[PDB]
RNA sequence: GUCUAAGUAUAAGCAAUUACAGCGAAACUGCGAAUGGCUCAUUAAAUCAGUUAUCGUUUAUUUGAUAGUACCUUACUAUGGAUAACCGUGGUAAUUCUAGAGCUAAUACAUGCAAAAUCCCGACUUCGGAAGGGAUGUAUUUAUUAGAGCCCUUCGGGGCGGUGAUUCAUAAUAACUUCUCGAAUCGCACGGCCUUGCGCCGGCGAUGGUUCAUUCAAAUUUCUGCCCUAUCAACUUUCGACGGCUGGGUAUUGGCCAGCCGUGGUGACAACGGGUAAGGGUUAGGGCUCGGAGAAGGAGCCUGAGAAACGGCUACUACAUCCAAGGAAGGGCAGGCGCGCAAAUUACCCAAUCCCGACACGGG
């Protein structure tokens, strides 16, 4: 029941969708780190028109988010989730622009089959078992032992297994997913530890603009290796 | 009333059980050979 | 009316304040348990997140640890010996946390003569400290409750040995 | 009373002293290492965790049961005067017996969980200086 | 059956006796499945312990019900905490005369059994079975709990204990349907080992051929090749024989036993624990060889029949392990150097003192 | 000084007029004051 | 209030060509109602704001995974009972008043026995695949343990889990529990082996389960910032005022409370007292956004993941309704007048946006 004006600005909405905006259901992604599926399909991608329209389309099993059908209308689709629609036969990834607003990449199954998920935390579970928690809140039993925090992992999304990983590297191109300079594509060139809390990295763009960003909100994409096709 | 469908559901339950357990066996064995390879490369650097 | 708040107290400057807000459900204080000697009288209560804790009020047997040699057994409770907080608790014989209490010696002596075999309280690895052997020939040792009987429903703890043993025996003599 | 004891280190055995670092480039003093005082509220001895805020300052009161008070002065900017105005504060921290305690010294203190109404803090380093009584004044 | 037991108890109380009268509520609370352990510790170490006057009147019914409750499988959990800790606490809290009557009710057909006669082996007895292997493994669990919770006090029942367990072992080694008999063998071995270190003064001498049939037939020609993985319960009984002075005369029976032990020592593919186990066995042998009169009753037996015919082989194997491999455990080093330190005053003449220096 | 351990002789305002004194007594007071006279001592 | 293929249908309910079949009133079950808003004495860094921290805490719902736990003296053998709704006999003057008598189901509450099973090891090995060696979950509590340059040389060369930090994570042992869980569920497709066995294996979901996440919350906590006033300089210790030790409860830290003693703590850098006049972010601008007490009155109790709901119960008080006089239920806002003379709909729909539920439909 929140207002369209209280709706965050990185998911876009015009002046004519009524005063209210729907609140996202709880899930893997965070509240303000979400674009709801209805906002995707009918408010950003305009494939349906009405609430009940979107509702009916999701009641029938036509869309699968990250390889799995999703039926709840306000499911959290936060960042680089792949969305297949088999009727048009088109898949979509959710990234930012340089302006820090949501952007959608049309894509086929060839690049759509995997996900570059950012590691949150590795642990030793019950039975002493090593498991992995990524940014998508997905856990992986028995990962490869080298992948610690601040690494990303190419994930199979059909078996969901590890397919690759990129190490946290001052020298790797990264992406900004938070803060005042949110959504700036550039290379990590330095990192300052700040032991005692809230350490940062120094990251310049491709066109000589260096800025200090927190290792919390950083997100690596590849050293060069554009493993997800950014739109030109 | 025991129906053959219900018996099949019991079979399906225990089949998913044994399938889960053998999958844990496979991932444990492959993780074991992976970590052996990794520590071999580590001490090879050493 | 019982709670845990700070609105009724004074500041660091010594000044009091009204700041009157109504007492709320996350400020809850619950009535204590006087866990005393009796048969098993334990209630169960759901709490924040519906989580159940066991309020024991009358308890007969607790599990105590002869862990310097490697066992722990569920023995009966005789009565409290000393409480570091309050002589009134010692008077009414209540079981709290860290409470030195006399217990029986029969299953411990049975385990000693079952593993080592040497009769006790009547080669070199079987060795009892002499004050503990005095407790053994008394048939009633001194253990201590290290569990919360009100907040776990049970009296678990360890036998009293050596330095703390002589310390609390001297305190008994005090 | 009761017996002071490290809670989970087995002493009455026939066949150790647990002291942890706080990290953050601090050194556990030898009195905290092997000094046979045991206090649950010392960082190296007890099981309390330092995190969050690190501070320092000058004691005004050493004479209390393991509790000093730091007078925190600062130059508050009054816009009406367009000036910096001295405002002293009063702080609270638990004193370990590990350190040698001086009056008027510059003492380094880090933040742990609240141990009383007032104390949320623990000494981590002491700098022995010749600071005078409350007549003295310095931004710190 | 719990329902059978409850109607049984109702007819027991239909027998109106003043002995059973003041404990009937305790019997009912024992049979009530929700208060078993706590009713047991109400019975024992409570205010209402059993009066020794009518104790004779109350013992048979309570021992019978307690047997039935230790046997019943329904409410038991899995693992050891399913019913094993129950039997553990039962025999921990029972009495020794109560233990005699308890083993009396526990042994149905093997209560009156004879395994040794004026001859050596009662093959006419051994070529028959009164029992299925389920009740046999249950018997062995019961007697293992008996021996472990009793300790020394197993002396006045030995003439039944050793007969029962040794019949089960000899039926097992005859049968070597394999799992039941293998586990019969293993738990009988461990219970006999605890029995050996529980009763020192007992005459184990009226039988030797039983130990021969247990040891020399299945394992001796394969013992190092099998125990290159780990210590077996045969090694456990050999170690308790090496520790007990009166069980050490059971090693001179076959003269190749210590050759196979030292061959296990010589095999370098062992996992070093069976190696230090063999070191401990020969260490206890030399400790008996240097111990005073209480062990000098059998010193001259072990000095001449065991140690003297194998000194050169001992030095050969220890030199093979001390010069062959490039890796050696430090515990292995300390244990082996201690064994040869204590073995040096045992020998006077040998053949490999050059190798040893 | 501490919590309640000192008898602060403070007049308690609601605790002030609880119950009126009810003299329910059966004898004539001369029996008992002679009785307290020649108790054990006399 | 709440229905989907996927809970329980014998409505003596409808509609038809063989336990059941479709539609499906009723009833049980599960979900809901931590809000929509109404009244009125206020809240002067205590809220609040930035800014931390939880290595001090609880979390229905989200999705992600997620359970090696046999045998263990019975020698024998896919389970229970209720009850609703339903049928009938009534009572009273009677309200969600209900008595007697007779039924039946569960995803409602309840118990729960084939010489194999499953791990770790493996000697020998033809990748053979294996002799045979050891061993038998989870939740609770306590104790213990673990938590791992130098020299030779051809001068080319050769050789010698995480945090800043934790008793953290994790593992095992000893016992412990009136201690749990480890599917006695529903629907749909129906195939391989052919012992054609009321066969053995076989897929897709719904419902349910332990733990950890994660979301959503909730809960403390750190530095700073209040407006004015000294006709406010002493104040706190007057429910401790400050410690530190020990216990209790709390989800947890905490004089938060109970025992022990110590001495405080604040203030002329403005304590304390008085007064009531109760802002923040979105920056060309203006705009735009966010912002305490009660449900007739005190006192006690009850559900739930979350309330001390104001939802209920109980007492006391105080009204006040019907009555056949014996009894029985119950306490809101809105409106019109407020001199006898005056002035804005008693409109309609959830169509859009948004919200809640067994749930595409129902309700807002």
Coordinates of N, CA and C in Angstrom, one line a residue, chain E residues 32 36 75 77 117 131 154-155 198 204 223 232 235 261 282 285 290 295 301 308 323 325:
Chain E
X32 N 4.5 -48.7 33.2 CA 4.1 -47.5 32.4 C 5.2 -47.0 31.6
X36 N 9.7 -45.0 32.9 CA 10.5 -46.2 33.1 C 11.8 -45.9 33.9
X75 N 9.5 -49.3 22.2 CA 9.8 -47.9 22.6 C 11.3 -47.5 22.4
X77 N 14.9 -46.5 20.9 CA 15.3 -45.6 19.8 C 16.3 -46.4 19.0
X117 N 35.0 -81.1 29.9 CA 34.8 -82.3 30.6 C 36.1 -82.8 31.2
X131 N 19.3 -72.9 20.4 CA 18.9 -71.4 20.3 C 19.2 -70.9 18.9
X154 N 32.6 -60.8 39.4 CA 32.1 -61.9 38.5 C 32.7 -63.2 38.9
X155 N 33.4 -63.3 40.0 CA 33.9 -64.6 40.5 C 32.9 -65.7 40.8
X198 N 39.1 -59.0 34.2 CA 38.3 -58.8 35.3 C 38.6 -59.8 36.4
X204 N 42.0 -70.5 34.3 CA 41.8 -70.6 32.8 C 42.4 -71.9 32.3
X223 N 47.2 -63.8 9.5 CA 47.0 -62.8 10.5 C 47.8 -61.5 10.2
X232 N 42.6 -56.1 15.6 CA 41.4 -56.9 15.8 C 41.3 -57.4 17.2
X235 N 43.9 -59.5 18.5 CA 45.0 -58.8 19.0 C 44.6 -58.2 20.4
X261 N 53.0 -62.5 14.9 CA 53.0 -61.1 15.5 C 54.2 -60.3 15.0
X282 N 54.8 -57.3 23.1 CA 56.1 -57.8 23.4 C 56.7 -57.1 24.6
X285 N 55.3 -58.7 27.5 CA 56.0 -60.0 27.6 C 57.3 -59.8 28.4
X290 N 60.8 -59.6 33.3 CA 61.6 -58.9 34.3 C 60.9 -58.6 35.7
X295 N 55.3 -63.0 39.0 CA 55.5 -63.3 37.6 C 56.6 -64.2 37.3
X301 N 59.0 -70.1 31.8 CA 58.3 -70.6 30.7 C 58.4 -69.6 29.5
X308 N 63.7 -66.7 23.8 CA 64.9 -67.3 23.2 C 64.8 -67.8 21.8
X323 N 65.6 -49.5 9.0 CA 66.4 -49.1 7.9 C 65.7 -49.1 6.6
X325 N 62.2 -48.1 5.5 CA 61.4 -46.9 5.1 C 62.1 -45.6 5.3

